[PDB]
Amino acid sequence: PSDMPVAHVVANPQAEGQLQWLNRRANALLANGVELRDNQLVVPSEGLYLIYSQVLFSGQGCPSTHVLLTHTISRITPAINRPVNLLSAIRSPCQANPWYEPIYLGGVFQLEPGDRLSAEINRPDYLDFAESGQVYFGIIAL
Amino acid sequence: PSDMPVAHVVANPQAEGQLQWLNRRANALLANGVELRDNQLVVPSEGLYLIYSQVLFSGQGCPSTHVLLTHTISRITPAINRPVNLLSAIRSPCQANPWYEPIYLGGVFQLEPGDRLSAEINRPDYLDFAESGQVYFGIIAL
Amino acid sequence: PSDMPVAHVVANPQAEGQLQWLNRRANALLANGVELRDNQLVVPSEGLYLIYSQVLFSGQGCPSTHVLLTHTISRITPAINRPVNLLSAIRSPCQANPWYEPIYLGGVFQLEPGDRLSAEINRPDYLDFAESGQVYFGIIAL
Fold first, then answer.
1. How many angstroms separate the CA of residue A68 from the nearest CA in chain B?
2. CA-nearest residue of chain B to C1?
3. N or C: chain C end with fewer CB closer than 10 Å?
4. CATH numbers and ranges of domains, chain C
5. Residues near A141 by Cβ (< 8 Å), separated by ≥ 6?
6. Do C75 and C86 form a contact (C-beta atoms < 8 A)?
7. What's the CA gap between A24 and A138, in Å, rounded?
8. Which residues of chain A lie closer than 8 angstroms to B6, CB-CB?
């Protein structure tokens, strides 16, 4: 534990089905006001924050070529409750023989106290996580 | 609600042709000394800065296989008027059937007041600033 | 000037064989306590750190399809002197036309004084340091 608000949650291996964020420990972090509610991060005070997140996709051979992987970081203010696209990226893996497609999103944003941030993916069934650090989501107060 | 120099500009949808950075946007930034001139960021004081940027490429089927996507972050010091390769990455999509190839660049650098930073791409025809959060460029003073 | 611990080492072109981190100056960093020993970064004090790294892979035509590129950032505490995956990602280039697959890893972690951090890759044969800004590794104290 230390100064400024901070969070660094990680995927859930046993949650084989969806993308659930957990407060584990190597240093998976979550303190100084920041809390995890409804699988989302909640900022404490007003200020500039650094938001980042990565997800790894994995597949055993392509179906056809109509496959698209997406990762996004939306911001939900308390006034409204809509998921405005802060950081978004897309990937088209296609076109034994496995395939892997990682995605990283990073950026600095001005956040207001009470805000709710989240990181979602469209195809949580390719979501790879057969190892520590292959998918995470975090933020820090600057 | 702020203090250190900071910038987080984004692509321009209507600039269908080139990569133009904009700031007059809700969750976008550009303040505390940092200004956007000639489509480039300009640092205020001397110090360590975090520079990041992402771009998303999109295509509708490959031409052949001789296609290379590149994203770079160069530095230009006032006196020495010359681009310095700070962050660079390359991608080869190729080898009906669309393709999405994102690229993220991040790093911490010591900058001198008056410096001019920029983020460029070689094939602005493959640029895909479709939805929000897809293509951006920012920096922050640590 | 600045005063928190910081490091931003880069690949070694002439080290044609392995991934060697170098710190001369500039446009890379390594100061304020942080040192580079045994090709690894060593933290000075206890606190939250931002760790990032990127590597670029390059190839001249695929062998078959059984090729996997990996980049990882392991930790090593004073107590248990063994690695600890902090950030890991994988990529599969294959599904004489060349190819380019970059990988970026970023995250915030709580580090204890005396810790040793490193960034490794499984196939240092494609590790592409032909240009500047293509392969780097750094950290900063928040």
1. 8
2. B47
3. N
4. 1-142 (2.60.120.40)
5. A4, A5, A6, A32, A43, A44, A45, A47, A48, A49
6. yes
7. 13
8. 48, 108
